[PDB]
Every structure is written in C-alpha cells, then in structure tokens.
C-alpha cells in the first residue's frame, strides 16, 4: 500500500509563513499533493462486523 506524496518544489509538506505589509497580517498556509494506492489489494483483508 503506497502513500504517494508530491511537491512541485522540495520533497514534503510546503508550509509558507508570509506577511502582507498592506494589511499587517501574517498568513500561515500549507499544502501537499497526496494519493494512496495499493500495488496488490489482495495483500489485505478488512475485518467486518
């Protein structure tokens, strides 16, 4: 089971802290692109109630 992470620059979560000098505000933003896929879904079993 593969958690596929993508970042256009760097390698992981982008967290940006910036200040807007027009409004006197610090913004803190973050992003990541993520997908998750089995390579072999046969390699797992759910337990069902």
- 16 lies in the site for a copy of itself, by CB under 8 A: yes
**Which residues are near other proteins by CB under 8 A?**
8-12, 14-16, 19-23, 25, 27
Lookup: tokens for 48: 């069902």
- Compute the least distance from the CB of residue 7 to other proteins, in Å: 8
- Compute the least distance from the CB of residue 35 to other proteins, in Å: 11
Q: Look at the alpha carbons of 36, 42, 47, 49 in this order and tell me if their dihedral is positive or negative.
A: positive
Lookup: tokens for 47: 């337990």
> How many residues lie near a copy of itself (CB under 8 A)?
9
């Amino acid at each position: 089971i593969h958690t596929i992470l993508y970042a256009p620059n760097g390698q992981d979560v982008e967290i940006k802290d910036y200040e807007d000098p027009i409004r006197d505000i610090t913004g803190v933003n973050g992003r990541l692109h993520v997908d998750c896929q089995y390579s072999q879904g046969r390699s797992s079993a759910t337990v069902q109630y």
